[PDB]
């Protein structure tokens, strides 16, 4: 159904150790398609996908020099920010920029965003409307009065409402086999003991795309919450993902409890119990 | 693809 394109930039100052670490990546949905790293030998915007490789050295050349200029923005930012908050050159510091677009099942613009953040903290962010800004400190308000006064909002909205979608659609069909799929889960249960009158059932779910998933428990059709455990979704390496949810129960009474599993691969939700 | 507009120093 719905889709998105994203970029995630991570710039980290390393004082005394020389130039800052710069790491940019690019995602469609939950499929990483481009990346750049300073410490990698390439010094070029590489592909993480096969379908992006299609495009020859016009795409890459520009996309590289785009991303160099992204780092060179942060190089200075890091300077200005150390200025702003009045930090010493001793301590290392971190900025993170994130921008991208959204579309529904009809492949047409929902929403765009541009988040920014010093030392793991919101600093400024382009609001929902893409016309006004939002600043966390006064430090950020200064930057707001720059980013407002120099009509950044104009140039940025046009990227997110325009370019982004014209390219997200392009990338979607260009690698349709991978991006337009849906891989199902593989939900099974492994019964595991804990105490002489107690049992712990794990409702596994493996080898699925997209990451989106909802696993929960039910004792006799009652939404069981507590005495469970639910790990945050693993990237499998695979490309697909995994996610289990546990439940510690009074023993013997094992097959009262149900595992209700929502996913856009499966026709409509799954309910399982111990065999 | 990446932006070439709307990105500026802080």
């Amino acid at each position, epitope marked *: 159904g719905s889709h998105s394109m994203r970029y995630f930039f991570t710039s980290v100052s390393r004082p005394g150790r020389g130039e800052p670490r710069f790491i940019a990546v690019g995602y469609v949905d939950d499929t990483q398609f481009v990346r750049f790293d300073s410490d990698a030998a390439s010094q070029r915007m590489e592909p993480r996908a096969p379908w992006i490789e299609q495009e020859g050295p*016009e*795409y890459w050349d*520009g*996309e590289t*020099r*785009k991303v*160099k*200029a992204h780092s*060179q*923005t942060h*190089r*200075v930012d890091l300077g200005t920010l150390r200025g702003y908050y009045n930090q010493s050159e001793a301590g290392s510091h971190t900025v993170q920029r994130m921008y991208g677009c959204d579309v529904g099942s009809d492949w047409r613009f929902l929403r765009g965003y541009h988040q920014y953040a010093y030392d793991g903290k919101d600093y400024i962010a382009l609001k929902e409307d893409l016309r006004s800004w939002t600043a966390a400190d006064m430090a950020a308000q200064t930057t707001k009065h720059k980013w407002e006064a*120099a009509h*950044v909002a*104009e*140039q940025l*909205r*046009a*990227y997110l*409402e*325009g*370019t982004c979608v*014209e390219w997200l659609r392009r990338y979607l069909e260009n690698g349709k086999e991978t991006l337009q799929r849906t891989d199902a889960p593989k939900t099974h249960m492994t019964h595991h003991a804990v105490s002489d009158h107690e049992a712990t059932l794990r409702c596994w779910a493996l080898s699925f795309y997209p990451a989106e998933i909802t696993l929960t428990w039910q004792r006799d059709g009652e939404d069981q919450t507590q005495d469970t455990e639910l790990v945050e979704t693993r990237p499998a390496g695979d490309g697909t993902f995994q996610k289990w949810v546990a439940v510690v129960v009074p023993s013997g009474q094992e097959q009262r409890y149900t595992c209700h599993v929502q996913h856009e691969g499966l026709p409509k939700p799954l309910t399982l119990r111990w065999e | *693809e990446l*932006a*070439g*507009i*709307g*990105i*500026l*120093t802080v």
Partner: T-cell receptor
Amino acid sequence: EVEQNSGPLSVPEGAIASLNCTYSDRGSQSFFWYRQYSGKSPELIMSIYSNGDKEDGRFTAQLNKASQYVSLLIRDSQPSDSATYLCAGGGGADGLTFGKGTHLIIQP
Amino acid sequence: GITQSPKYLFRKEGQNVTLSCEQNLNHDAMYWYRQDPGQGLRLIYYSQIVNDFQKGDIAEGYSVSREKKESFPLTVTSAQKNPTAFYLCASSQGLAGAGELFFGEGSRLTVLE
């Protein structure tokens, strides 16, 4: 790489003066119209980033990234409007690439 | 604003000549173009950020610094056969070629054979 209909395309005082231009790059995200007089320094009059029209006073600029069209038409053309109009675009930290030019010469 | 000097000059062979281009707008981007009567303007160098500059179409025979954010002086060296032209400097706010390009006032040049 950004070809323009180099002229001179000439118009009388009050007649309308449309200029066209097209560009050889799908990653272009910024598009401009600078106006340069003889031996003088260029000056912006129309910047357009998104598709559709975008007017300002007597000048109107339009963008279509599908066909790669950019335009500028000058309704109510004075003789202050004479001399060379420069089409130019970019948007990939590559600098900016100017056109040949078009001498818009208004007959007084 | 942005300003460049001199508006007019030349020098003979076996010598350099540098052109100053200072701006106080607090602009990151800065570019020198040369416009040959005949052609439109061709790019020589641009400068996204301090201590960084980047090749244009005809930079071979031209040199540039960028030590402070304001000045971006183009050295024309004892190198080219056709220096003779009109040399425009400019700064933009944002990334390179992203924004306005506030131009200077040019500088005419000549081969004084």
